[PDB]
From a paper:
The degradation of [name]α subunits is promoted by post-translational hydroxylation of prolyl-residues located in its N/C-terminal oxygen dependent degradation domains (NODD and CODD). These dioxygen-sensitive reactions are catalysed by 2-oxoglutarate (2OG) and Fe(II) dependent prolyl hydroxylases (PHD 1–3 in humans). The human PHDs catalyse hydroxylation of prolyl-residues within the N/C terminal ODDs of [name]-1/2/3α and are negative regulators of the transcriptionally regulated hypoxic response.
Author numbering: 188 to 404, 410 to 414
Write the structure that this text describes.
């Protein structure tokens, strides 16, 4: 689909109704696999962190580490398709502008590329923006070809505010996910038993981020 049709006819109404929106086959197999290739290249060349310290043993050789991070601006050599992805996310958001909540999105973060190494680690339940830091939408792109969560785990489980039920999102290849970043969407990553990659950017609301800057401060000489 074109960004505009998908945004107007699916993403906006879905986000406003549920605060979670799943878009399958966002870029298609060729581009998706190119992104996968770049992400794996970054991994294989050591551009990721060693991963979140999960268990700190008395000894450190047996330390267990979870999700590995790298921040990608999108102009880096070898990250050209990632930059293409980020631009396509941005086009999708731009063609929603004004219609997602009352938010006026005026910026985003760089891309946080995560790699769960497949050793059983996941990510604890949390809220992305609990303190009013300006992030209003979480956007995640999944690159894991033929992911079977029944075997490999790694479901993102969201606990939408004031609902008994979970929303389980499998980290399926070429899948794009949006959710409100605030307390309406606590979530966790269930233990991943295979290598799981995802690419996250957060979009800022202009007003929230403007007054976050006020409360959190940016110093000029007298
Ligand atoms: C380090 C860090 C990771 C995440 N990632 C996820 O919630 C997982 C989404 C997915 O991969 O499905 N969120 C925050 C607020 C921080 Br900080
Ligand atoms: Fe999160």
């Amino acid at each position: 689909l074109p960004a505009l049709k998908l945004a107007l006819e699916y993403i906006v109404p879905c986000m406003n109704k549920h605060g979670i929106c799943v878009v399958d086959d966002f870029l298609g197999k060729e581009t998706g696999q190119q992104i996968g290739d770049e992400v794996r290249a970054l991994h294989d060349t050591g551009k990721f962190t060693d991963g979140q310290l999960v268990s700190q043993k008395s000894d450190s050789s047996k330390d267990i580490r979870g999700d590995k991070i790298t921040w990608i601006e999108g102009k880096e050599p070898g990250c050209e398709t990632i930059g293409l992805l980020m631009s396509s996310m941005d086009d999708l958001i731009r063609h929603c502008n004004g219609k997602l909540g009352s938010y006026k999105i005026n910026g985003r973060t760089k891309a946080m590329v995560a790699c769960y190494p497949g050793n059983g680690t996941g990510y604890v339940r949390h809220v992305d923006n609990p303190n009013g830091d300006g992030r209003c939408v979480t956007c995640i792109y999944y690159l894991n070809k033929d992911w079977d969560a029944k075997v490999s785990g790694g479901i993102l489980r969201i606990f939408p505010e004031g609902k008994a039920q979970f929303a389980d999102i499998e980290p399926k290849f070429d899948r794009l996910l949006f959710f409100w970043s605030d307390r309406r969407n606590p979530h966790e990553v269930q233990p991943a038993y295979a290598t799981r990659y995802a690419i996250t950017v957060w979009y800022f609301d202009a007003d929230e981020r403007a007054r976050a800057k006020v409360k959190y401060l940016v110093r000029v000489e007298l």
